[PDB]
Design a protein around this ligand. Structure first.
Ligand SMILES: N#Cc1cc2c(Oc3ccccc3OCCn3ccc(=O)[nH]c3=O)cccn2c1
Lengths: 413, 544
């Protein structure tokens, strides 16, 4: 009766053809095991030379658990299915989700495995498990069921998900539930404990309806905002300090028009030593106070344009701290923030950057219902090599790499 | 009886329709002689006059003209055929192979003609042997097998061979078969007799599926010449490299030279391609005769000296550690060796930084480690332990303050010079008891004259005129002037974000001589604090 939901591609677009990155023997073995089991379950099947298309595949860890998880990178196929998952079958994004005091993220991905995939479309799910040293051409598969990571999967399953969630939504009308990819985001204003009990109730509800889900993952979007720019606070000021001040303020003159550096500039008029301590005048203090006052107000006329893509820029602040800005257009910031982590040695740069990208992406999902394209402060090949190590997410955001940044530290810090 | 692979034409297209007049007579007769024996073997089939499609046919000859050869130009059909999976992008590297007690190379003849073509697609392969022209009806044919030069032939053949290999590979899990397009490479730890038995068994297997294999026992004997390599039983190397000596050198000859040198660099340590590539920097005139510089000829001489004696690599042992060691050649060139053993290299290689006008040793070392890591992942499926000519405190100092995110795996320090060091570090805070130089420079986009200069807090002022310089050049020249005229501790102030950008990157070398001199000065100094201010805000700025 239900058969399979037919999937069409935007006319003029062929299937994705993407290279398969070389993998560790360990990860190749893990993928072989996983795919053997999946083929045994009918989820995927082997294919011949007449299937040109290919999608990248990786091996990550699921919960941080000792068992491997297969991660298919569907970004390209998503771009090519956009008409299907966005316009035609699209899922509405609630704007009240970011309001809730606590948001838990549940993994509903397994739900997609039961539902079959449209025959004619299956050839576009093709992927290759690589061989070391090109010993053999890789192992070729295609999906016989809705694949995780594809945006068409939750789109097709949307009705079923709605029907399953309906009895829970009625008993809890003040609970917001959104579905992005394989993830179900649940917000509430409840106390942390009773919130967790409610999330557990939802777990048991989904479970007795057949949906399996694998302390907890808890965001707090009510604390999320656009962070204000902070000027240095010193008892005394030297020539150098005032120079950094005037420079930073002049940079901020792009974000706000109403910045006046005049009285601070007239103080440095004579050419002096950098370490010479120069006291502030009354006009200078007036100007500093005025600028500090205008600096704490949000930027004027900054709104989110749904059609435009989000852009997240990250910069490294040292000492395990990173800063980021999410924006659609230059010098208009929809979101800014700072990410940090554990002390001692839990750590290294790539790990922190990865966890940061995941955090920013999740925030971006909760807020605008879509992911930003990152500008990453890292060598391309380095990131391409090490990113799958620390990656716990089931989706993959878009990214590129910058050799540029001038940023120093202090300006965003 | 091989299962065919279904093939479609590209959507919105139909079978190729072409007309071929050429040529002559004897070629037609030869085409008849060939097509009759081909039809006899069932590879092709004569179709009665209909309205099918058509493809051009040519007839050519190999050496010893007693042999005749048929050729079909399929380009018009290939454009209309569907895309296929990539056969293979690259070849296995000998350093990544594992030693087997015996290795046998088998090659199958008429490989494509030994595999069937999808039935419904066959009609698109139709061609015509023209009768000598009285208007006499021509001879129509079509392929029942994979045609040579057809887009789908290599991939379909590959998969066919794989599926044919499947049942034999199940009965013999302890023998290793590498598949290359026309070739099979089998290997085993089995005693020689058992090996010959297994190989003959495989030969009969393949023969039952219609695949021919060499009748002479194993055919070729080690060492094998494969894809430019030499595989000996216990060792691997490259086929002999010949560096020609000429009075005149064109761009093509330099291309070939750089090619051979690069190809040699995998096994032979020390090969330097820098200057010879500098000759090839020009994109202009691919036929242009290029005079060799002295550095290029010295480099080439050194490469000849290295290539004088032969060297060879060993194979891979999974039971042993994978080590990689890096040395700096000093011109911005780096070399490395990958080994499980002290006197034996699995392979070697080189890294060189082409992009950017400014860099430093530590960054380049990082990049090299990246390249080696990638290559190791590709070839051996793992990453090597690193032996690096850098102190841990140096590396730490670098990656802690570096704006990017860098990563190096477990590595140990090797004392072999030249070491990788930080030749200077700018002060993070201004220096008390040090003269403050306010520097500036400017130019004229038309005349390109311009000037550089400084004004200090102690009253010192200087302006030096320049010729054939740009704005950036003068902006750097100002800072250089400040460095020249100051003491061992100096505070410089510049309005140029460019110059600040170049200097704060802490380069230990550059293409520009100016930047080099600035580096020398920075090294000579004890404490240097460089600071930036907005230009034209009328604070500490120079006006010239
Ligand atoms: N013509 C040629 C040719 C031979 C091979 C090749 O040989 C092997 C085949 C199966 C197993 C191990 C092998 O080699 C392992 C290393 N080795 C290679 C040669 C030899 O005699 N002994 C030996 O242990 C592999 C890849 C490309 N090739 C190209």
């Amino acid at each position: 009766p239900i058969e399979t939901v037919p999937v069409k591609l935007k006319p003029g677009m062929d299937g994705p053809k993407v290279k398969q990155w070389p993998l560790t023997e360990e990860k190749i073995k893990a993928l072989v095991e996983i795919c053997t089991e999946m083929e045994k379950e009918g989820k995927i099947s082997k294919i011949g030379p007449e299937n040109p298309y290919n999608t990248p595949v990786f091996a990550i860890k699921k919960k941080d658990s000792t068992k491997w998880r297969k991660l298919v990178d569907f970004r390209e196929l998503n771009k090519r299915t956009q008409d299907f998952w966005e316009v035609q079958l699209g899922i509405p994004h609630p704007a009240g989700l970011k309001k809730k005091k606590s948001v838990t993220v549940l993994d509903v991905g397994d739900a997609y495995f039961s539902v079959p995939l449209d025959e004619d479309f299956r050839k576009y799910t093709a992927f290759t498990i690589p061989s070391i040293n090109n010993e053999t051409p890789g192992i070729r598969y295609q999906y016989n069921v809705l694949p995780q990571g594809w945006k068409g999967s939750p789109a097709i399953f949307q009705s079923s998900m709605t029907k399953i969630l309906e009895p829970f939504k009625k008993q809890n009308p003040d609970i917001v539930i959104y579905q992005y990819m394989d993830d179900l985001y649940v917000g509430s204003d409840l106390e942390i404990g009773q919130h967790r009990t409610k999330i557990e109730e939802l777990r048991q509800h989904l479970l007795r309806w057949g949906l399996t889900t694998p302390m907890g993952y808890e965001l707090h979007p009510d604390k999320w905002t656009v962070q204000p720019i902070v000027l240095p606070e010193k008892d005394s000021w030297t020539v150098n300090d005032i120079q950094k001040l005037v420079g930073k303020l002049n940079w901020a003159s792009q974000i706000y028009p109403g910045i006046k550096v005049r009285q601070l500039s007239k103080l440095l008029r004579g050419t002096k030593a950098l370490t010479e301590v120069i006291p502030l005048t009354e006009e200078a203090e007036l100007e500093l106070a005025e600028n500090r006052e205008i600096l704490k107000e949000p930027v004027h006329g900054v709104y989110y344009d749904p059609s435009k893509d989000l852009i997240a820029e990250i910069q490294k602040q040292g000492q395990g701290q990173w800063t980021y800005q999410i924006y659609q257009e230059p010098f208009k910031n929809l979101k800014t923030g700072k990410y940090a982590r554990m002390r001692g040695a839990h750590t290294n740069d790539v790990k922190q950057l990865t966890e940061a990208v995941q955090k920013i992406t999740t925030e971006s999902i909760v807020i605008w219902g879509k992911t930003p394209k990152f500008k990453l402060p890292i060598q391309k090949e380095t990131w391409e090599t090490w990113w799958t190590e620390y990656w716990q997410a089931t989706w993959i955001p878009e990214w590129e790499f910058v050799n540029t940044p001038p940023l120093v530290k202090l300006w965003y810090q | 009886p091989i299962e065919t692979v279904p093939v479609k034409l590209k959507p919105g297209m139909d079978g190729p329709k072409v007309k071929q007049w050429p040529l002559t007579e004897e070629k037609i007769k030869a085409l008849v002689e060939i097509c009759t024996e081909m039809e006899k073997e069932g590879k092709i089939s004569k179709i009665g006059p209909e309205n099918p499609y058509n493809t051009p046919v040519f007839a050519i000859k190999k050496k010893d003209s007693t042999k005749w050869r048929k050729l079909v130009d399929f380009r018009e059909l290939n454009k209309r055929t569907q895309d296929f999976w990539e056969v293979q992008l690259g070849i296995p590297h000998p350093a990544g192979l594992k030693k087997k007690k015996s290795v046998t190379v088998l090659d199958v003849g008429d490989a494509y003609f030994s595999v069937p073509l999808d039935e419904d697609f066959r009609k698109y392969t139709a061609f015509t042997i023209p009768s000598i022209n009285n208007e006499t009806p021509g001879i129509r044919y079509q392929y029942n097998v994979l045609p040579q030069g057809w887009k789908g032939s290599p991939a379909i053949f590959q998969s066919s061979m794989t599926k044919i290999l499947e049942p034999f590979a199940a009965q013999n899990p302890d023998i290793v078969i590498y598949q290359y397009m026309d070739d099979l490479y089998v290997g085993s730890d089995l005693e020689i007799g058992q090996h010959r038995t297994k190989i003959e068994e495989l030969r009969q297997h393949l023969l039952r599926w219609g695949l021919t294999t060499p009748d002479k026992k194993h055919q070729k004997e080690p060492p094998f010449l494969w894809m430019g390599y030499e595989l000996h039983p216990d060792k691997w190397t490259v086929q002999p490299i010949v560096l020609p000596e000429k009075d005149s050198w064109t761009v093509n000859d330099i291309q070939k030279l750089v090619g051979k040198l690069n190809w040699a660099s995998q096994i032979y340590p020390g090969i330097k391609v820098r200057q010879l590539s500098k000759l090839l920097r020009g994109t202009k005139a691919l036929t242009e005769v290029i005079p060799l510089t002295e550095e290029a000829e010295l480099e080439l001489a050194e490469n000849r000296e290295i290539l004088k004696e032969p060297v060879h690599g060993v194979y891979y042992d999974p039971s042993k550690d994978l080590i990689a060691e890096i040395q700096k050649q000093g011109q911005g060139q780096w070399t490395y060796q990958i080994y499980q053993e002290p006197f034996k290299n699995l392979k070697t290689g080189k890294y060189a930084r082409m992009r950017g006008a400014h860099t430093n040793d530590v960054k380049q070392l990082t990049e090299a480690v990246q390249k080696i890591t990638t290559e190791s992942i590709v070839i051996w499926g793992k990453t090597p332990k690193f032996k690096l000519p850098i102190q841990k405190e140096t590396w730490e100092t670098w990656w802690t303050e570096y704006w990017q995110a860098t990563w190096i795996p477990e590595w140990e320090f090797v004392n072999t010079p030249p070491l990788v060091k930080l030749w200077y570090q700018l002060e993070k805070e201004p220096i008390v008891g040090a003269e403050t130089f306010y520097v500036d420079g400017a130019a004229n986009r038309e005349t390109k004259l311009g000037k550089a200069g400084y004004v200090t807090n102690k009253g010192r002022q200087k302006v030096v005129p320049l010729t054939n310089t740009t704005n950036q050049k003068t902006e750097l020249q100002a800072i250089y002037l400040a460095l020249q005229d100051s003491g061992l501790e100096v505070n410089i102030v510049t309005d140029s974000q460019y110059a600040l950008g170049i200097i704060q990157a802490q380069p230990d070398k550059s293409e520009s001589e100016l930047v080099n001199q600035i580096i020398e000065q920075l090294i000579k100094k004890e404490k240097v604090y460089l600071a930036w201010v907005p230009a034209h805000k009328g604070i500490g700025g120079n006006e010239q």
